[PDB]
Symmetry: C3
Subunit: 294 residues, 3 copies
């Protein structure tokens, strides 16, 4: 797209503020940003806020979101679909033209770990180019295992294909499959989907801790067989809904857009790989590390 040649829009911070006990404002951008997805490989991604996946959003169960999208893309319209919300797609997930803004309001009544993504036709194109992310909705009533959790992180899985190539998007294997981490608390890492960052800079934890991971496989196209090497999931909440409780899972199957809350104990010092156990995907990038110290 001629109007994207040479474009590299610097990342813009997410903006959120609470405006009532059950109402939260969120402002995001759609913007075109170069991201290094593998060593030596730049992808001129379509993004929210200059990150792919996009910035993490966290709200409380029962919050109504008053969402603004500022479209900085000079030529392509963009939109927002939060899986967390109840909304009319044809009224509330509609396009925002280049250099314009739109505001949409809708409730997040269900706890969990939801995908968000651009909803502009062709949606495959917009997602595959990088317009995906996660919104976490915290349960009013928490999770039954909250008291045991010692540390937590967010991990997102996505694929990368040949750049902006609809034939490949539809018909081809992924070039890369990758994890990223999005920060929940100051000091947490905040990374993009790439083959290397979470190997070079592992997530951190201490011996004996119970770790919670909030996870989502945003696709676009693949399912995920999520596994932490050297442990077993004590507890799993499918989609992050506290009612959807499994125990003692080795591996969690995630559909495309599928989420979970998973919890596990790291018993010994060392480095613990985190994979999709579809090992072709692991080999093309989808291995993160968790470094556990005494």
């Amino acid at each position: 797209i001629a109007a994207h040649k040479g474009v590299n829009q610097a990342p813009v911070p997410l903006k959120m503020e609470r405006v009532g006990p059950h109402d939260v404002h969120i402002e995001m951008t759609a913007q075109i940003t170069d991201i290094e997805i593998d060593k030596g490989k730049i992808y001129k991604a379509w993004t929210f806020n200059g990150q792919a996946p996009g910035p993490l959003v966290v709200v409380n169960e029962g919050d109504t979101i008053h969402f603004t999208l500022k479209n900085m893309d000079p030529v392509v319209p963009h939109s927002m679909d939060f899986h967390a919300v109840h909304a009319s797609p044809s009224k509330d997930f509609i396009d925002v033209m280049p250099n314009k803004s739109g505001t949409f309001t809708y409730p997040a009544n269900k706890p969990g770990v939801f995908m968000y993504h651009c909803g502009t036709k062709p949606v495959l194109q917009h997602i595959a180019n990088g317009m995906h992310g996660v919104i976490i909705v915290k349960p009013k009533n928490g999770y039954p295992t909250d008291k045991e959790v010692d540390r937590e992180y967010v991990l997102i899985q996505n694929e990368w294909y040949k750049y902006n190539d609809m034939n490949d998007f539809q018909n081809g294997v992924p070039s890369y499959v990758v994890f990223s981490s999005k920060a929940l608390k100051p000091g947490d890492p905040n990374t993009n989907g790439d083959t290397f960052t979470l190997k070079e800079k592992p997530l951190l934890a201490k011996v004996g801790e119970k770790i919670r991971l909030y996870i989502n496989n945003v696709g676009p196209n693949e399912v995920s067989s999520f596994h932490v090497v050297g442990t077993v999931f004590d507890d799993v909440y499918l989609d992050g809904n506290p009612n959807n409780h499994l125990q003692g899972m080795q591996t969690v199957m995630l559909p495309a857009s599928g989420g979970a809350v998973v919890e596990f104990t790291v018993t010994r010092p060392g480095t613990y790989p985190i994979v999709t156990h579809q090992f072709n995907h692991a080999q093309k990038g989808a291995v993160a590390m968790l470094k556990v110290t005494e």
Copy 2:
């Protein structure tokens, strides 16, 4: 197959009748029928009754089915395998030769949303050519959320490949992935697996209603990440067994042959896409619409 050149057998209605408090007769055909699977694209399908997927069958838990297959295919044998039933495959799912009939009897003791399909070797060929469908077995004891359901429909997902091409069937990506709807009550639509009908003629509902969808992914080869845009599933019953209860799912993973009952509320007027969230499949047809009016 030379004996299928020029063959286009008109659709024949399903025949069912109850013959006892726990016994039901069902008669189907195997027949060769041209179906438009994408605009401008005819597939000379192998079918039950001239539909692909085949006609919907609904029985009650505990019914014994006395099933007759009339094979109208002039040259290929066909058979029937209902996932709902307990049967000896080598006695009860056996071939019916061209221009012959066979009758088989077996019980449906388990509630749910089951695949049915031809079972003739190579089964991949028979399924991929269109010999698939759904049988719903209604639970004696209903579902706990029956009182809240305002409207219901059946949706089936299948793939289409290059015509009658075993290499493609085994090794290739699907050409199309599609939804169809099969009628439960007079006035409901009854469609075949194609890329366009349920976009052109959306399923209908009213604002505020809780909708139930009976769903099955018949494959042949792909899994499905089933999602309704703009809502969250309040309740999910995996395989349609009332005991297999999930809540607050964004997306339901379905294996090949996998079913579910899913329920969700449409809160606002508008059009709600229904997808597999494996967006390569969505892009090659697997988007249906639900139009919600005041």
Copy 3:
């Protein structure tokens, strides 16, 4: 690998012995062994003990395993990762060089049907070449349906690719997808992953019996849609954890590395195919048989 030309190391029996009420010794080899994976097709597999999948391991919940690996491969290092255990991957799943041994100790505190596999980089290569298997951890407290089970077997699903071809491993469809059975009691079959043995020599059962299958899909790359033709699963325990209970499932979705305990009744004499319902995989080998006699 020049040092593997002409190498065909005879299978070596697994060695296990209990050394305390909660401690068990296990010794395995890594070795290079020719296996006929399809009629006329030899694969010079990388194996544990000359089987692919490897030998079955069964321990009790709460057992600590003191595991020795003897690496007989003349040139490639190998390792062991049991999904059953809690361990430091970087200390306990480390490489054993050619012609050396290593011993590692770790607990199996969680009941279920776990994958084990080589953990040497590239792990895709080691798994795809055949270094996979199952460890069953028996629950202290059994399964609630134990009293109804009349007969049981272990089945494992894996894929085979072009020999030792990392491009194919990462990017290609599987050449074959296969079941094997691993013996639990004297007289049970013990087979390798191939397209034909469990068709030629079906698993055996008697009319009316409730059968339990312990199942795992070791991949490397595919998910599985596990189904027994002519029955419905009465009970399913995901990953073999008794708490993860489903009922009345037609088909069980298994991630890569995913396990289950599944139980079903065979009501009539005959032969019952056992498939992955991803029928492209079934067609490339993944059909086993269960012969049921009066």
